[PDB]
């Protein structure tokens, strides 16, 4: 039986087939592992093989170098480190060769590279790997498939290996990563992979963001990537904008007004959930930040010293624009339930709530007008919106400021509790369930 054949039977629809292929490949790993890893790795490398087999092979390598279970993961990484060095050099090569020689899109090689780098970079046993990959991205004569395969591998390593293990090689990786995102880069498949690796590289790139020169460049490449017509990129591009807002709030005052604001706001409005959800996520992070900041401030006040860092009250500022966009998104509610299911609505709720606890004061006045106008609306959607909007701001604003509004609204509220709509009925239950638990 050629290995190719067994690899293939791991997808066979026949339940027996599946079985055999599985036990045969399971014994192999536990009884001829060095050989097994070499053959497999040889399969993965030959463009003459089927997407099916090439991929099955790759998986078998990954599943022998990593697990989701921490205890097994180490065991495997130990088992590998203790294999003959040459055999591991032989495998390390076929894998690394495969880069750029794959037809199918999700690179079966990338997983392998990370699965080994994860066990060898920490004991300096594969020092060629990083500079190598960095080159595949930076050599101009490099094929697109090369740059994509590689950028994906960089991403997995950036993702599965401790960030401290790459702090000394940040610069190189960042260059290669940003290279794949430049406007000039043709293939969006590459631009995607590159942007996806950048997301995991933020943790160990602090050095770079602190240098006004470089950071200024990164925000450009990221911002321009949010324009890429390939949605898939536009999403990952915003994903970085969000994670950055979190890690580098202090450096943002330069980009916030002249670009970030417009981008994220349009983002919260695209009909494409995947996108909207990211725009929302953005501000929800600004809030977490500006609240922790207000706390740090309240603590330095009781020390007679200015606070280390300072809020710029972006949330409080965008409040006039955020609220109407959020309340309206509370309209686009999915009729057949998406119960826990994270859609633009559920998120726009959580956000409004975060705003209310972040601007205990300024919030109520921007939301109220919407509530009053649509509380008695014929459309169950806009109605439910008003009901939710109200129950959202119930936490944060001074109790004294809320009590009058509660009481003067309690009538129509309790009535909504038995509204014809089954959705308004649950919402009205929640809002009322809050007006209690929050203030008897």
């Amino acid at each position: 039986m050629e290995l190719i054949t067994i690899l293939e039977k791991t997808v066979s629809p026949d339940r027996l087939e599946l079985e055999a292929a599985q036990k045969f490949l399971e014994r192999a790993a536990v009884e001829n592992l060095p050989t097994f890893l070499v053959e497999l790795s040889r399969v993965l490398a030959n463009p003459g093989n089927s997407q099916v087999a090439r991929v099955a092979a790759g998986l078998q390598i990954k599943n022998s170098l990593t697990s989701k279970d921490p205890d097994i993961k180490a065991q495997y990484q130990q088992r590998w480190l203790a294999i003959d060095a040459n055999a591991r050099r032989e495998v390390k090569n076929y894998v690394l060769h495969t880069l750029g020689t794959e037809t199918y899109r999700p690179s079966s090689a990338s997983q392998c590279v990370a699965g080994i780098a994860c066990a060898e970079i920490p004991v300096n046993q594969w020092p060629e790997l990083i500079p190598q990959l960095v080159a595949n991205v930076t050599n101009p004569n490099s094929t697109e498939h090369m740059k994509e395969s590689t950028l994906e591998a960089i991403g997995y390593i950036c993702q599965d290996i401790d960030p401290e293990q790459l702090q000394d090689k940040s610069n190189e990786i960042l260059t290669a990563i940003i290279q794949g995102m430049r406007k000039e880069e043709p293939s969006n498949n590459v631009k995607l992979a590159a942007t996806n690796a950048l997301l995991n590289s933020l943790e160990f790139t602090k050095a770079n963001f602190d240098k006004e020169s470089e950071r200024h460049f990164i925000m450009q490449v990221v911002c321009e990537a949010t324009q890429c017509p390939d949605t898939r990129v536009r999403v990952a591009a915003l994903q970085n904008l969000v994670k950055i807002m979190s890690l580098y709030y202090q450096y943002m005052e330069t980009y916030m007004g002249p670009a970030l604001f417009a981008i994220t706001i349009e983002a919260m409005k695209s009909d494409i959930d995947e996108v909207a959800l990211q725009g929302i996520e953005f501000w929800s992070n600004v809030c977490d930040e500006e609240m922790d900041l207000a706390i740090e401030a309240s603590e330095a006040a009781e020390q007679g010293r200015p606070p280390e860092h300072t809020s710029k009250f972006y949330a409080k500022g965008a409040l006039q624009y955020l609220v109407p966009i959020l309340t309206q998104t509370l309209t686009k509610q999915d009729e057949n339930d998406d119960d826990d299911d994270w859609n633009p609505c559920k998120a726009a709720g959580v956000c409004l709530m975060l705003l209310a606890t972040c601007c205990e004061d300024d919030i109520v006045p921007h939301v109220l007008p919407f509530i009053k106008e649509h509380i008695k609306n014929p459309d169950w959607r806009y109605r439910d919106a008003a009901v939710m909007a109200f129950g959202c701001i119930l936490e944060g604003p001074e109790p004294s400021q809320l009590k009058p509004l509660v009481i003067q609204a309690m009538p129509t509220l309790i009535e909504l509790m038995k509204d014809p709509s089954v959705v308004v009925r649950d919402t009205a239950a929640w809002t009322v369930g809050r007006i209690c638990e929050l203030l008897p």
Partner: peptide
Amino acid sequence: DDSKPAFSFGXXXXXXXXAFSF
């Protein structure tokens, strides 16, 4: 082809603004 250079992160140089761009 006279293809693009490559920005290097490493050795660089850190009454109105000259802000930011696209």
